[PDB]
């Protein structure tokens, strides 16, 4: 009855309300009945007598608590619910919900959103915090944000909550904490213009079993490979559900044409006698890709007359000369050299190019410094497809929407990402917390490591 | 040492009571065991040595010799007093042009030989960068080097630091 007339609602400061972390009591560690104190942000367990929230309320004179699961506010030590609409942004920062009208109009958001502190931001164009060595995963998670259908899947918890898990399955923590992070990143009424990905990364550390730590940085291509495969594994309900959202968004079908070269150290009569052996003929081992791996030609070891930078440079179509049915790539394993041709059959709606920068030579890992000269608003991938296929694929023109760039040495490297904000046409370089507005002409000048493209 | 150990183990139990110090203790099974277990291990060593008997850092030098051998096998054998010195000078010239960040394109050189020299220069480049950084961690850590290793290292690191600095300037441009 003293709901709607609580005195202690001025005592709330949203400057300390960090709802990004583990909802455990800060005394008893318990996830059961955790309550945020809205005066200091610290979580405490229980709303009854001799609980930690009650004893905290009388210990600190902090008399207003929010149930972290029920989203109901409470005055302790004396107890009653608080029903105030001015506290709704606290629950919306704690648990962002997205209606279907809010998801459909989510990419048509030209006006800036304001945080609770005076910091304007755009939803999704939101900095991810850097714990020690993390920017590979911040870059990949900001790349899978701003992919609209994967985002729209992970913005409704109902899209993935009811799907079946094995009993001792830790791998679904990736799915639910990725959804939590996606709802925090696209939150239009946040309390700060940045989101700590720390719970998402503890899910990454636990699920990859200390592959992709936070203290030691990994490669973004390895993390994106594992993370798309692990989201696709965990969004299958106690089975390989063959089509998840990750397959529906990123996966295409290529047609690899492996051809065994006979052996190089043979005479010519035996070398063309081995052609009819049909072990040295073409195969078709047609498979599915999450991402296309683009191999740069190596740094040319010498500068050359023509352009005078030491920085080498390839067009995008020359490293997309792989994945047409003409260009053959040498594969070399022990005793056997193959001539793999590639052929794109199903082009995904959102195509990832993982441009291979780091190769290990005989002595160390060298980063290819070659700059891919790509357009950002039109690549007609029509001619990288069979004519058996180009009648099915009506739209094959892709626009770049995300560009993860690795900067520096392979050892002391950093990751930034140019994301295209939809609704505007503006591009933003997010290096982990700072959000620069980058120009559309300056994306193609950086070392493109991972790229995500949208089929229109 | 072990047999002496067992002697100290045995004697100091043997020489108790009315038994004093002296040469009369022989409980030889412990040491005899130890020497037989040694014989177990060196039996196939001495057997392999008798079967063999009673029968019937410088990767640039090795790499340069190997690539010279790989061109010198595939020559027309009419010409090896003529071209084997010139392609060695081409190897060393391509390496000098890599160390200088200057273009090396010989127009009259045939592109398989050019591609093998390019390959040699890339292998020596990776070894050279790695041995410059390794010798620098050796020198900086405090490991004992002489004058020519430091002088050589400083030249390698000067060319590497100026390759990185030229890449830094071109990244600024």
């Amino acid at each position: 009855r003293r709901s709607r007339h609580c005195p202690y609602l001025d005592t709330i400061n949203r400057s300390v309300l960090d709802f990004d972390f583990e909802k455990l009591c800060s005394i008893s560690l318990s996830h059961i009945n955790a309550y945020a104190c809205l005066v200091c942000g610290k979580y405490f367990q229980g709303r009854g007598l001799k609980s930690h929230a009650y004893i905290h309320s009388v210990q600190f004179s902090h008399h207003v608590f929010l149930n972290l699961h029920t989203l109901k506010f409470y005055c302790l030590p004396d107890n009653y619910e608080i029903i105030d609409s001015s506290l709704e942004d606290i629950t919306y920062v704690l648990k962002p919900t997205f209606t279907k009208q809010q998801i459909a109009n989510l990419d048509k958001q030209a006006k800036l959103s304001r945080a609770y502190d005076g910091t304007t931001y755009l939803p999704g164009i939101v900095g991810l915090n850097n714990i020690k060595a993390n920017d590979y995963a911040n870059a990949v998670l900001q790349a899978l944000s701003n992919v609209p259908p994967l985002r729209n899947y992970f913005l409704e918890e109902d899209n993935y909550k009811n799907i079946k898990r094995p009993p001792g399955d830790i791998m679904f923590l990736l799915v639910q904490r990725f959804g939590e992070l996606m709802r925090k990143l696209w939150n239009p009424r946040n309390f700060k213009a940045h989101v700590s990905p720390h719970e998402m990364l503890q899910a990454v550390v636990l699920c990859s079993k200390k592959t992709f730590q936070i203290t030691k940085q990994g490669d973004g291509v390895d993390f994106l490979s594992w993370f798309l495969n692990a989201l696709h594994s965990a969004l299958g309900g106690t089975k390989k559900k063959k089509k998840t959202i990750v397959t529906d968004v990123f996966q295409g079908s290529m047609r690899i044409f492996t051809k065994k070269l006979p052996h190089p150290d043979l005479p010519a009569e035996e070398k063309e006698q081995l052609l009819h052996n049909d072990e040295y003929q073409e195969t078709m081992v047609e498979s599915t890709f999450m991402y296309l791996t683009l191999d740069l030609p190596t740094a040319p070891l010498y500068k050359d007359e023509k352009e005078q930078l030491i920085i080498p440079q390839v067009p995008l179509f020359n490293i997309l000369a792989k994945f047409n049915g003409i260009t053959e790539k040498e594969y070399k394993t022990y005793k056997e050299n193959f001539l793999k041709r590639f052929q794109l059959t199903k082009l995904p709606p959102y195509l990832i190019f993982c441009i291979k920068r780091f190769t290990k030579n005989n002595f160390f890992v060298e980063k290819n410094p070659t700059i891919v000269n790509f357009p950002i608003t039109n690549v007609d991938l029509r001619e990288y497809l069979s004519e058996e296929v180009q009648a099915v694929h009506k739209n094959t023109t892709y626009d770049l929407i995300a560009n993860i760039v690795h900067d520096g040495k392979p050892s002391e490297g950093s990751y930034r990402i140019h994301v295209l904000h939809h609704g505007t046409g503006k591009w933003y370089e997010l290096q982990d917390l700072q959000v620069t507005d980058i120009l559309p002409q300056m994306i193609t000048l950086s070392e493109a490591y991972i790229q995500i493209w949208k089929r229109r | 040492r072990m047999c002496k150990d067992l002697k100290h183990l045995i004697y100091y139990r043997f020489n108790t009571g009315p038994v004093g110090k002296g040469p009369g203790c022989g409980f030889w099974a412990a040491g005899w065991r130890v020497w037989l277990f040694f014989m177990r291990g060196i039996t196939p060593l001495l057997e392999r040595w008798l079967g063999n008997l009673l029968a019937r850092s410088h990767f640039d030098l090795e790499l340069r010799a190997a690539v010279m051998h790989d061109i010198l096998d595939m020559m027309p054998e009419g010409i090896k007093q003529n071209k084997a010195r010139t392609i060695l000078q081409h190897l060393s010239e391509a390496w000098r042009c890599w160390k200088a960040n200057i273009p090396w394109k010989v127009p009259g050189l045939p592109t398989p030989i050019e591609n093998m020299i390019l390959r040699y220069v890339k292998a020596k480049a990776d070894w050279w960068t790695n041995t410059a950084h390794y010798n620098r961690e050796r020198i900086r850590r405090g490991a004992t080097v002489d004058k020519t290793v430091c002088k050589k290292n400083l030249g390698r690191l000067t060319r590497l630091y100026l390759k990185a600095e030229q890449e830094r300037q071109h990244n600024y441009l």
Partner: peptide, 30 residues
């Protein structure tokens, strides 16, 4: 690998070149 086991591909493609291009190899005096 060993060194010539890395250079074997280039040695076999070096077998391709003709003898008209062997004595026309310049020296480094230029």
């Amino acid at each position: 690998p060993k060194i010539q086991q890395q250079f074997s591909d280039l040695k076999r493609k070096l077998a391709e070149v003709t003898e008209e291009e062997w004595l026309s190899i310049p020296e480094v005096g230029d």
